[PDB]
Design an enzyme around this catalytic site. Structure first.
Site, PDB file in Angstrom:
ATOM      1  CB  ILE A 138      36.304  75.332  35.993  1.00  0.00           C
ATOM      2  CG1 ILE A 138      36.307  75.202  34.461  1.00  0.00           C
ATOM      3  CG2 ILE A 138      37.493  74.608  36.602  1.00  0.00           C
ATOM      4  CD1 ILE A 138      35.768  73.904  33.939  1.00  0.00           C
ATOM      5  CE  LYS A 139      32.647  69.846  40.914  1.00  0.00           C
ATOM      6  NZ  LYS A 139      31.856  68.892  41.732  1.00  0.00           N
ATOM      7  CB  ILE A 140      38.403  76.974  41.314  1.00  0.00           C
ATOM      8  CG1 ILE A 140      38.452  76.734  39.801  1.00  0.00           C
ATOM      9  CG2 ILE A 140      39.807  77.252  41.856  1.00  0.00           C
ATOM     10  CD1 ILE A 140      38.917  77.919  39.015  1.00  0.00           C
TER      11      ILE A 140
END
Length: 360
Positions: A138-140
């Site tokens: 998940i890109k955060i």
């Protein structure tokens, strides 16, 4: 065999910076893994936007989603998750053989909630559970609000691609958040050996901003410094990587957070297309390249060993020289962060517009 293979032997894994459905149906994504030695992929809203506006690659599912009652948000959600989960399946073999480091497919939470820790975390869990594939990431972003959501997410066993890192100061904060993430994951009973993270550190952006400012100064010396700061900045990040993970005490079985060079497509026609690959090669790294940059490396090569490990002296000299010429590096990095968030959010609205155009 190939120059990308040689780059991996130096220590740098090659990922592809988009997951367009064109690539999947055409067989390009298999080909790129099999022939271009690609071992990871990421989503790309701007490219996704364009593909729906100018191509028929999504036509089938748009017909589906227009048949059901799908809102713009639901359509965009459905389509990108189906792409990502499809890519996850195909990268399963590499995920398993690479001790979970590679074979990764990254997907972002909504860029509009990036100042909202709670909401970022909520959507990270949601995406994590929906995709339901262990090699997804998940890109955060490393921006206010979502930076501490990074440790919260890792604490729940979610693997995180940290994005929008522009400066070494903020990279230091990202590493700290990773270490705390994994410490909390252990305390929460999770097997820390299956939690992974990469720190996506932007390269070309810095040279775009600084090349302008060097041209404004206009002196011989300023002009001779052009095209050096992006590489130098990344190399300084690598020194920090080594420093903080040397000092760190991670629970046993914990993975390292590999630096990842993003935005590694050259933006000036005079610069060699391999500049942000050859100069950033070495141990424990990833480079997320545009496919055109992958093809430049494959046909042109121009690798010359590990250019990261012994690089700190050179890189500092670039920075001390930039600051001697009066370039306000703290202001540069603040402009990049603000422009970074706005670009990030802007390309998201561009995707929402594209989508809306097809659903009518």
């Amino acid at each position: 065999m190939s120059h990308i293979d040689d780059l991996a032997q130096l220590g740098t894994s090659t990922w592809l910076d988009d997951l367009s459905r064109e690539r999947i149906t055409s067989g390009n994504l298999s080909q790129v893994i099999e022939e271009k030695s690609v071992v990871g992929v990421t989503t790309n809203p701007a490219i996704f936007a364009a593909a729906m506006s100018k191509g028929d690659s999504y036509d089938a599912q748009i017909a589906e989603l227009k048949a059901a009652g799908a809102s713009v948000d639901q359509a965009v959600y459905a389509m990108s998750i189906d792409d990502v989960r499809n890519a996850c399946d195909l990268f399963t073999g590499i995920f398993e053989s690479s001790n979970g480091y590679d074979g990764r497919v990254s997907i972002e939470v909504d860029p509009r909630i990036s100042a909202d820790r709670d909401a970022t975390l909520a959507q990270a869990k949601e995406l994590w559970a929906k995709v339901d594939r262990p090699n997804v990431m998940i890109k955060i972003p490393a921006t206010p609000g979502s930076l501490p959501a990074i440790t919260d997410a890792l604490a729940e066993g979610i693997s995180v691609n940290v994005t929008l890192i522009f400066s070494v100061a903020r990279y230091r904060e990202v590493i700290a958040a990773f270490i705390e993430g994994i410490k909390q994951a252990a305390a929460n009973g999770h097997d820390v050996s299956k939690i992974h993270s990469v720190a996506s550190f932007f390269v070309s952006r810095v040279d775009v901003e600084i090349d302008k400012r060097l041209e404004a100064i206009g002196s011989d010396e300023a002009l001779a410094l052009r095209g050096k700061a992006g590489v130098a900045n990344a190399q300084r990040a690598y020194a920090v990587y080594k420093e903080l993970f040397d000092a760190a005490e991670l629970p046993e079985g914990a993975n390292t957070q590999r630096p990842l060079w993003a935005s590694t497509g050259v933006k000036n026609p005079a610069y060699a297309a391999t500049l942000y690959v050859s100069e950033l090669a070495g141990p424990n790294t990833v480079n997320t390249m545009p496919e055109g940059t992958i093809d430049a490396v494959l046909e042109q090569g121009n690798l010359h060993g590990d250019t990261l490990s012994n690089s700190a002296a050179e890189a500092d000299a670039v920075f001390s020289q930039l600051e001697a010429l009066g370039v306000d590096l703290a202001d540069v990095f603040q402009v990049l962060e603000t422009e970074g968030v706005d670009k990030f959010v802007a390309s998201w609205s561009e995707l929402l517009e594209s989508m809306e155009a097809r659903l009518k």
